[PDB]
Amino acid sequence: KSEIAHRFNDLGEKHFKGLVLVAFSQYLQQCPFEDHVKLVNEVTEFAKKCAADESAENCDKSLHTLFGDKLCTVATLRATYGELADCCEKQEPERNECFLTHKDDHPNLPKLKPEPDAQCAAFQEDPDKFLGKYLYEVARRHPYFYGPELLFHAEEYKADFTECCPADDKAGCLIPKLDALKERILLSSAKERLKCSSFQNFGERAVKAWSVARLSQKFPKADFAEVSKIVTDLTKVHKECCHGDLLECADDRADLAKYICEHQDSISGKLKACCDKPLLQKSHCIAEVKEDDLPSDLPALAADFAEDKEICKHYKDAKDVFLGTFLYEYSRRHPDYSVSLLLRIAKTYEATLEKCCAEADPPACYATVFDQFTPLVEEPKSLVKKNCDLFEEVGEYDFQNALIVRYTKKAPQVSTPTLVEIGRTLGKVGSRCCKLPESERLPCSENHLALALNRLCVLHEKTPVSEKITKCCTDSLAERRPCFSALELDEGYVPKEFKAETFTFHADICTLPEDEKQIKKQSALAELVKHKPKATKEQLKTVLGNFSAFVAKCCGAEDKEACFAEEGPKLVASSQLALA
Ligand SMILES: O=C(O)Cc1ccccc1Nc1c(Cl)cccc1Cl
Ligand SMILES: COc1ccc2cc([C@H](C)C(=O)O)ccc2c1
Ligand SMILES: COc1ccc2cc([C@H](C)C(=O)O)ccc2c1
Numbered sequence: 037k038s039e040i041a042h043r044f045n046d047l048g049e050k051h052f053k054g055l056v057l058v059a060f061s062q063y064l065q066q067c068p069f070e071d072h073v074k075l076v077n078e079v080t081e082f083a084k085k086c087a088a089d090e091s092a093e094n095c096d097k098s099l100h101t102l103f104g105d106k107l108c109t110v111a112t113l114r115a116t117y118g119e120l121a122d123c124c125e126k127q128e129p130e131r132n133e134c135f136l137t138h139k140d141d142h143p144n145l146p147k148l149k150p151e152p153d154a155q156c157a158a159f160q161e162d163p164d165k166f167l168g169k170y171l172y173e174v175a176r177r178h179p180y181f182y183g184p185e186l187l188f189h190a191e192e193y194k195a196d197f198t199e200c201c202p203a204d205d206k207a208g209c210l211i212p213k214l215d216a217l218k219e220r221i222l223l224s225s226a227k228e229r230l231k232c233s234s235f236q237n238f239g240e241r242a243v244k245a246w247s248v249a250r251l252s253q254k255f256p257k258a259d260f261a262e263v264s265k266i267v268t269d270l271t272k273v274h275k276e277c278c279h280g281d282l283l284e285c286a287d288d289r290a291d292l293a294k295y296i297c298e299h300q301d302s303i304s305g306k307l308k309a310c311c312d313k314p315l316l317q318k319s320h321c322i323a324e325v326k327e328d329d330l331p332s333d334l335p336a337l338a339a340d341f342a343e344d345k346e347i348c349k350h351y352k353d354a355k356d357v358f359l360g361t362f363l364y365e366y367s368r369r370h371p372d373y374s375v376s377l378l379l380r381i382a383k384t385y386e387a388t389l390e391k392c393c394a395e396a397d398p399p400a401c402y403a404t405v406f407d408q409f410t411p412l413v414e415e416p417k418s419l420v421k422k423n424c425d426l427f428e429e430v431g432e433y434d435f436q437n438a439l440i441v442r443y444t445k446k447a448p449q450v451s452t453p454t455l456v457e458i459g460r461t462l463g464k465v466g467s468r469c470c471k472l473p474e475s476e477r478l479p480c481s482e483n484h485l486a487l488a489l490n491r492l493c494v495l496h497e498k499t500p501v502s503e504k505i506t507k508c509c510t511d512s513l514a515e516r517r518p519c520f521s522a523l524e525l526d527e528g529y530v531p532k533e534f535k536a537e538t539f540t541f542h543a544d545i546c547t548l549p550e551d552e553k554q555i556k557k558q559s560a561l562a563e564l565v566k567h568k569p570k571a572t573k574e575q576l577k578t579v580l581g582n583f584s585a586f587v588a589k590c591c592g593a594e595d596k597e598a599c600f601a602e603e604g605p606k607l608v609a610s611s612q613l614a615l616a
Pocket of ligand 1: 426435436437442573576580
């Protein structure tokens, strides 16, 4: 009768409010914290009235009518959000559709800097307001963050402050915890964005195919029926969340988590751990759960997928099922392949049946179908071993450097901050994945690269600058990585005009944390490539070494700025000669 009552009742006041805060922060990213709290409280008050009497006026309206109406009350909307006021003239679903379309993936808000005294203080004078603020700050920075999971991370954030605010060493307890929480936020943000990007750019059939492969790897003892059931339900969950319907998404997620733990015995022995937990931790745990051991009765596949004479009829009679089945089977036995590699193999199997079934004798044609997968598998294994060798020889900083050079050559039109962010994220894939046991390196690498490349695509959507990127981003989800890997120096590119200030450093740099020093150096590196696109990697590496050396010296100096001022312009001129 009243959706708002229903969700309120299912979720309870705490989570209802939390989720409704997230929604509003993500939709209206610039509004101050206080406006949002007020709007939340109001909606929540409405919900309570409806829970008391679902016949009451307007209680029957949809959530989005209700929430969309609420957002359209904010003061200074047309000033703050010029582009959004027009959305408020529209009805639903056209309205919500407009709000979504204008969500910002790179609002470039200030970085969230742990300030342990000020924060423990604010925490103590009002913990409820302190945690709301966290949800708000994160939601706003990541307008597609998986709602339910943000509530989860908010609990971890509360545990952090609970533990550390009364400790001997406040920052010793707290700054590493919050640094690791921020890594976990960024990674989770990037996983969820890929899901919503997959719905937007490729459709639900693409999200389902990804999720069949992934969950078949994770739960290889489950049967296909069960995998499909979970994938169907998980797909709806994310479709809701990616469409800003967070209350429905949370409720539906909890139903799923219950389902999974009721049937954990016929799903995976790894879920026991997770099913013994409170709600949000449980959901988090199932979502991140490790892959089960491979059953001893995995069926040989030749017979059904290469040898049977009826394949062409079966395939024609129901393509999506026959293929989904193939994908389930192949993926469950292949936790050692990435999801994209599995999807590229499925598309080749498909392509082989399309080809062979239109020929005179299909069975002799499709008899060698499994053999066409060999090169699909070797290419990425070889790439991962090569980049991991490099990573291990040179370390994170220089691997990031190598990737920054790589990406600037491929897309020299992209802004420097994007190239640097992206080269740095790509480089961290080496740190995450290369040290893992070797059978894990390919899946770790490609699954994480999908997250980084999607980020590039998402930023590119905002600020299109290169047709090569557009094409790689939109042609084929499964082929993205190979498509990006194949790009080379854009030759059409006119070297960017030399501007000496760009390469000109000052003593300000000396006071930065290491991190931020690297970014400054890494930004100059991209600029060196834009101006000398044909310089080799070996030349850029030497020239940047000379820049680091110079920065280290001048920062070690008696009179830092005089140092920078005398030595710098010479290095700037001479380094250009060392390039292309
Ligand atoms: O770029 C690569 O693929 C690897 C490579 C090999 C030899 C020398 C330098 C580089 N990369 C690289 C670059 Cl392009 C700049 C600074 C530091 C490094 Cl390690
Ligand atoms: C029913 O079977 C499938 C199998 C593989 C698929 C792969 C893809 C990828 C994401 C692609 O890039 O096209 C999509 C749909 C698919 C459906
Ligand atoms: C194992 O570690 C990595 C890290 C970064 C990588 C980037 C690339 C890109 C897509 C490339 O353009 O080749 C490939 C492989 C990679 C492996």
